[PDB]
Amino acid sequence: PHMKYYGNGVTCGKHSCSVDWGKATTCIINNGAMAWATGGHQGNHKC
Amino acid sequence: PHMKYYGNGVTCGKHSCSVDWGKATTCIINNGAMAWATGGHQGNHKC
Amino acid sequence: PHMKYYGNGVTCGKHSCSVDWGKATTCIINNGAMAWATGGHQGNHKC
Amino acid sequence: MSVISIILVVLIAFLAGIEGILDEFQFHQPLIACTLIGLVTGNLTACIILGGTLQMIALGWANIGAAVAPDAALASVASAIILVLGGQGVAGIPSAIAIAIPLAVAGLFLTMIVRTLAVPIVHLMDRAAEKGNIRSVEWLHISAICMQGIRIAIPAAALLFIPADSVQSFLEAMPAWLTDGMAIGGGMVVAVGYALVINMMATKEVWPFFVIGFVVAAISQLTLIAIGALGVALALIYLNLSKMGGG
Amino acid sequence: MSVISIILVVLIAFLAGIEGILDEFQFHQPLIACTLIGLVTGNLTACIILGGTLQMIALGWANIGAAVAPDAALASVASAIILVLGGQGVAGIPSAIAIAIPLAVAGLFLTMIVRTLAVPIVHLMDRAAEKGNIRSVEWLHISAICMQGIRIAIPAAALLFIPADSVQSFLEAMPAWLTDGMAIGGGMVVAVGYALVINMMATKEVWPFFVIGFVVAAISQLTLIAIGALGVALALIYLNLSKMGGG
Amino acid sequence: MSVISIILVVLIAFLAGIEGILDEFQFHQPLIACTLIGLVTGNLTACIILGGTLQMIALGWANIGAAVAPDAALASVASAIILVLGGQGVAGIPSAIAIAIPLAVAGLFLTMIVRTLAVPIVHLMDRAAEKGNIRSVEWLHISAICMQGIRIAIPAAALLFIPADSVQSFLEAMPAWLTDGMAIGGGMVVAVGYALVINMMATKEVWPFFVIGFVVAAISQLTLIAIGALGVALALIYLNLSKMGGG
Amino acid sequence: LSKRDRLRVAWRSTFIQGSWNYERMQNGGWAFSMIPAIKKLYKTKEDRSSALKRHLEFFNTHPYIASPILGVTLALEEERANGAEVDDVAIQGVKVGMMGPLAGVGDPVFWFTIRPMLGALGASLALSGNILGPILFFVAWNVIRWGFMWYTQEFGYKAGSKITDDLSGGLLQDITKGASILGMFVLAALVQRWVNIQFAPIISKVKLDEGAYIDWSHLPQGAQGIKTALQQQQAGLALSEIKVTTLQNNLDNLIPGLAAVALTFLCMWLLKKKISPIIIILGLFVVGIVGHLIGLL
Amino acid sequence: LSKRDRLRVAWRSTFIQGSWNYERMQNGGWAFSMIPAIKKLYKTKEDRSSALKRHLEFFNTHPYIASPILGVTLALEEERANGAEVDDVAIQGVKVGMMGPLAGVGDPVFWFTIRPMLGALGASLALSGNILGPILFFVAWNVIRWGFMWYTQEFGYKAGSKITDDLSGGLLQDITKGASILGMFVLAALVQRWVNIQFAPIISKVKLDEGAYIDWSHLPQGAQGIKTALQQQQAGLALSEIKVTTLQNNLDNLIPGLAAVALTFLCMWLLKKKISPIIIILGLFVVGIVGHLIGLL
Amino acid sequence: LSKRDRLRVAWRSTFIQGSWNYERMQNGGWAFSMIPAIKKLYKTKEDRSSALKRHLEFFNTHPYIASPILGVTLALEEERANGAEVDDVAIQGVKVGMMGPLAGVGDPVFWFTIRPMLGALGASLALSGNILGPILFFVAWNVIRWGFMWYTQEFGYKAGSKITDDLSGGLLQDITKGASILGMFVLAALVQRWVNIQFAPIISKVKLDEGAYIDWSHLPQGAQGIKTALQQQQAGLALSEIKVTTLQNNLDNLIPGLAAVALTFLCMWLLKKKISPIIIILGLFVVGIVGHLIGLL
Numbered sequence A, B, C: 001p002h003m004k005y006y007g008n009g010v011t012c013g014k015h016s017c018s019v020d021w022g023k024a025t026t027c028i029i030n031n032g033a034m035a036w037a038t039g040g041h042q043g044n045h046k047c
Numbered sequence D, E, F: 001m002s003v004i005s006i007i008l009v010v011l012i013a014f015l016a017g018i019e020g021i022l023d024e025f026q027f028h029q030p031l032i033a034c035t036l037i038g039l040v041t042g043n044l045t046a047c048i049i050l051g052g053t054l055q056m057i058a059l060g061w062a063n064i065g066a067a068v069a070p071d072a073a074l075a076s077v078a079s080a081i082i083l084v085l086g087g088q089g090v091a092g093i094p095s096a097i098a099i100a101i102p103l104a105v106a107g108l109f110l111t112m113i114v115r116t117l118a119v120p121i122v123h124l125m126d127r128a129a130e131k132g133n134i135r136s137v138e139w140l141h142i143s144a145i146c147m148q149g150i151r152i153a154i155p156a157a158a159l160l161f162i163p164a165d166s167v168q169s170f171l172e173a174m175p176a177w178l179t180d181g182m183a184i185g186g187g188m189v190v191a192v193g194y195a196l197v198i199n200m201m202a203t204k205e206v207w208p209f210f211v212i213g214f215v216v217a218a219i220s221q222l223t224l225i226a227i228g229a230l231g232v233a234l235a236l237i238y239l240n241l242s243k244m245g246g247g
Numbered sequence G, H, I: 001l002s003k004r005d006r007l008r009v010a011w012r013s014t015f016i017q018g019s020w021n022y023e024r025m026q027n028g029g030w031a032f033s034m035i036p037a038i039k040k041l042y043k044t045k046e047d048r049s050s051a052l053k054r055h056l057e058f059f060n061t062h063p064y065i066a067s068p069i070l071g072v073t074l075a076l077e078e079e080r081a082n083g084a085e086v087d088d089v090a091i092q093g094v095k096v097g098m099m100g101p102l103a104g105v106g107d108p109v110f111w112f113t114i115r116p117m118l119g120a121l122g123a124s125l126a127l128s129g130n131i132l133g134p135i136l137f138f139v140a141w142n143v144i145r146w147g148f149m150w151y152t153q154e155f156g157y158k159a160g161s162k163i164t165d166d167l168s169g170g171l172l173q174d175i176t177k178g179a180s181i182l183g184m185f186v187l188a189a190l191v192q193r194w195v196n197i198q199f200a201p202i203i204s205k206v207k208l209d210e211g212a213y214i215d216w217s218h219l220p221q222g223a224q225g226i227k228t229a230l231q232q233q234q235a236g237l238a239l240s241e242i243k244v245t246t247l248q249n250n251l252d253n254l255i256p257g258l259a260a261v262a263l264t265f266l267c268m269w270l271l272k273k274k275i276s277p278i279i280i281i282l283g284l285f286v287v288g289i290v291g292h293l294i295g296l297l
């Protein structure tokens, strides 16, 4: 195993780190929606 | 491709047209239920 | 076919009968919940 | 088998028949009936195993209103009797378990017939009440109890003078279409048990909750406990909202 | 084909055009239009089969407010005419059915154009009403009826003096990207039909029900009838709770 | 590495420690801390890439009430320092990213320890307030700020005089059962963060909504945004129905 | 009446299900259990007859939870012997006001909460051949049952007046309303899920076009055919070239469980037509047999 | 007016959709249907013009369900000729208060309940070449249509006053409110399920690690490879070694049907901007064509 | 106090989280930020001490949204120096009345709305080595934060009286109630979905009958075995001949997420027992380690 995942669409492979922006935007939007629905109490979750 | 579908259970193959009445009755009942629930505003949908 | 099922986690194979207690406990809990929700009117169901 | 053993098993069958309708001391439960039948015959431990297995099977057989239970009493007596007078103490248990289930349905039919027959008994009780006779009502009640006792005392004694592989042979020499029809009809019977409840409590205020429950039940990812919890929450919200404008 | 047959088919096309808007006698329905066009031409049974098939297809094409229907009239007239003047009485039906669907969209476009053009007609009717002329309003209304009759009378007569494989040839000699764009755009048109309804009835107190319906629709195990039943139950509960504190 | 570079990296670590609690100028964010560390050492662009990557990872690390965030400050400082004093400017970034995550948990533990230690500080502040000394309260507040600054100033200076592959070596020379236990326990920690909220807002009239949400969450086809929209719609309906009978 | 008469009534109340006719279910047992009280209060020739008519009316509840009601009936009736002007007013009121809600809680408690756990505990020991299983079950059930009956009958007799009028209260009606809503919901779910009606007539067998089935005659051979077949199945293509649609599929296209709810409503109508449940059950068995004979089911 | 005038009005009302302009849909047909009534009541030079303006205002409902309204409009107008002080007060109110709710029940009844079944029945015979199909459909539709129009027009005329004031009642309000709630719910479901907007741009093509795909190059050979592939698919392993994520996948990750509801809201805004629906439909066709041209759709 | 004193208070309010003890979270920073106001108003020996005790009580909110409250605390306190008879009446009331609702909106606004977007925008440029990313993030966050603090503090101070009494209003309670309902719903969903507790003990391993598994030893060979295996899997047959049931399967048979909600309730009980969250978190880590050691988790 050499392709890890760190959340928010960050891979950081064995040689370089790349960000897929679709997954990052989805994570940002979902986290913001949960924060607005719970008053910012949704906690830290690896999306 | 030679077996088209035209909705309401109509096939109209390359040589003849056949109607499967179970699918036609299901389409009729579903369209009627949607019309009664929306006041006849469900629109035209290929069922 | 020689491994029948009689409900509540009872097998009663061709030579012996054995009870798996996880399924029996699940059946008991589900039946009790249904009886409490329906006033004991859930009927006889092979769980 | 000794004649005294026959007398004791007939008495135990009569007691199980009585407690099938009384349903208080639970002499009709397999856990008690099987060990009672095996104790008076010498097949103690084997009948204990059979009773434990059948009780594990018959954990939810309860009479609720007019929806009679599968009548675990007849199964408990008859399967134990057939196990006793067939040899194969411990290894014969899966055959008794297999033959118990249809005999439970047979006992259900018999007890339904007797509960139907009990109506003229209470009619005569009313007629005697109009005459001011306080003891004949008791006599008729005891006669009704004895009728349900006999309902099981008779088949258990009939089984004693026939070969062991008679119920099993009759069940195996049965047409397949009959077995499949019985199996199909057994899955629709519980609906009747539901209908009686719906007739009891059904108002124009609670029918929408029935509709919501019926719609929600189609979602396979929701368990029965989840559906019950949803119903409890909906009822609580409805009660909270009902008494916010009324008062 | 005889000239009298031409006169009769043009008359039936005019009647179908009139009944496309009138929508009372249903001369524009395939079940009537196809058999009428085939009776005056000798192709009775073939046109009856085609009309039955098209009516089976066009069971839900109804005009609702400003959401115009696919206009089954033009398809019913033109596909049947092409079937008549192309030989292949019974075996040519699948070609008429295949060419009917795009021609229904063409008729929808034509009837939308004429409905848009009808606005100055009622403007002239108003200007005549302010002058007190009661007969010119009738004349303008009849002229509007005749315009929509002509809307279908013209294409049916144009198809008469051209080869049968002209509509099919034009449809087949069409770029694939255009056909795919039309197919994609046809799945989004119904949304407009929804919008007109939402603009009609939308208050701040029914929007939450819209949100719940939109969320619930994502559950594929719930059918459309189940969703309708859930909506009915929710509306009934809401109505019951509304008048418990008000009164 | 020059001694002046050591002085500046220690100063940046102290500033990051201060802003770990202050959380206003965001000197503790990777996007600023990494470039500040790399600017005073010559590894500008590599530290900018590392800071961007870590900030992309640490987009949702926020302290909410007593639920402390993974403390991106220590990770940002230490990963950047280890990248600087290990060569491999751009290619060493995936190692710094890999070692940052457990060090974030270590910094979280350290900051909770210091927050617990801060209680006697405010106790002394109260005891000084009862004496009427206005400056000693300020001095205690500044001492509390400096303690949290030192909380990160110390590990960053300790890392400077040890070999680069010391944190990574310690992490790799760790038993597998310990790593798996920490991973398992990390998925249950957020529940505590939920409990604090539930203890804050929980009444007998909102518990049914909790039950409905818990039941609904089992439907995998419903997204989190869909669940939020359903909750908003339910709250709106409840609010509308509450004041329909009250007024 | 003294404590001796109350204990006699309690002991005689264990046969309250002795007759169990289908028309008035526990009227016979209820009248039987009240015989010593009637003999103690009314003695001449006629008040006993009126009491017999009073206690021979329709009665049905959980047999063990019938002891508190009896106590109330013991408390209210004793006044009539002395004289309290409450005759046929509440004696028919408390029974019908208690037989429903008390059965709705005693059925889940004894039949589905205590008995299943006690039976499982006894069977645990019984499956190893230990006699302690049945003995434990018997003793634990009977001691609890008798104690509950006696304690609740004594409580009902002592608090006879404090509880007959408290029935008309907000708590009881709120419990009844919530129980009705929950029961309607859960019984609808149970009608949908536990009533098994599966039709097996084949309605249509239209074949699929040659772009929709996997076509297992021109597929890769060896370690690639499996992968491409799985990918085709993921794309939604069908395994067989012919599509079979059954009556059950068309019924499920409208809504799942339509046959179950229709049968339930038909059973409700038949019961409302004063048809005994035994006839309906015996007719459902025959209907299943016939439907299997003609291929419908 | 006599019964002959009412019959003439009813016969003339079958052309109520003759003009159908987009701004005032059935104003022309409604004004046409009232011409003989206006000529019968107002006769000099001016009240006819005022009646024309009254009946040339916006009107739209189901064409067959417009007959009772006409009857009411026949009853209310006839008083004005005699004199009742009700001028432009209620003659305008009943039309608006009836055109909506009556269309909401006549559209499902005639367009989607009677017509589909009649057409299916006719087509059943027509598919065998029987002329009886179309004839039956025509006669059954036309007799019912004319009878409905005449009967409802007569009922509306005779009950002119009894129904104009009963409109302001609790039953109509409750029906309207429940219909609004049900329509909002079902239309939201229909927007989600029937408005098809599928995007086909590929966003990311990140390859999977060598622990997540089935790796169809080192698999068992013969009757075991299939089993292990199915077990790995059940374990959640992917068929292909590269994971392709599209724009549609990212949109569905937020909520399914977001594009459909966004397009519906945009159409609502455009309609509120007083833009005709024909322009919006033609713009959506062009938008679909362009999106297919640029690969977006 | 002039604008200069308010500016010093605002500048000193940026260290409001300097202590952040677990017992009274932001009491120290709140007391620190009010030092110049206390020195300006109270001066002799004792009113300063009383003010310190007042401002050393429990306080916790979003650090940036604490500026308006300070302004209100600035406005109300200044009267006490002059004299307004409002002492210890509302100074404690506004703090607790605003610390909750204002935190509930400031946390999503700054921590989860502005900061994530600003960080993503900065990282976009930073991943290419551009220094403009971090600089843009720092400047955009700093200017917005300071402007918000100053503007809201000035608004709260100038509107000192207009907002302390408007807190008791229908809008605030309606917002609080709706937020409570939405939060309960969404937090229940998050407890079910994000609290990961997976058990791995195997409970039962009962083998399946020879009519329910695919039996990959008598299957077609070549292009037909795959098809028949897929058809059997569609029929519901099992891949393996032995059925393995885990404790997680039995727990999910009751309801999914039961362990998560039970752990959440236990955490609520422990917090109600006045146990610090640090101890609970450190005990959950140890519980996970132990459960992995004993195979439970």
Ligand SMILES: OC[C@H]1O[C@H](O)[C@@H](O)[C@@H](O)[C@@H]1O
Pocket: D023, D062, D063, D064, D065, D066, G025, G026, G060, G061, G062, G063, G103, G104, G107
């Ligand atoms: O609740 C109903 C109650 O009365 C019925 O007649 C009997 O079947 C009891 O076993 C049951 O508990």
Ligand SMILES: OC[C@H]1O[C@H](O)[C@@H](O)[C@@H](O)[C@@H]1O
Pocket: E023, E062, E063, E064, E065, E066, H025, H026, H060, H061, H062, H063, H103, H104, H107
């Ligand atoms: O309900 C609206 C009603 O009026 C519209 O103008 C026409 O499309 C009718 O066909 C429709 O039934």
Ligand SMILES: OC[C@H]1O[C@H](O)[C@@H](O)[C@@H](O)[C@@H]1O
Pocket: F023, F062, F063, F064, F065, F066, I025, I026, I060, I061, I062, I063, I103, I104, I107
């Ligand atoms: O809303 C709570 C609020 O106060 C807490 O003490 C800190 O963690 C802040 O970061 C947080 O925003």
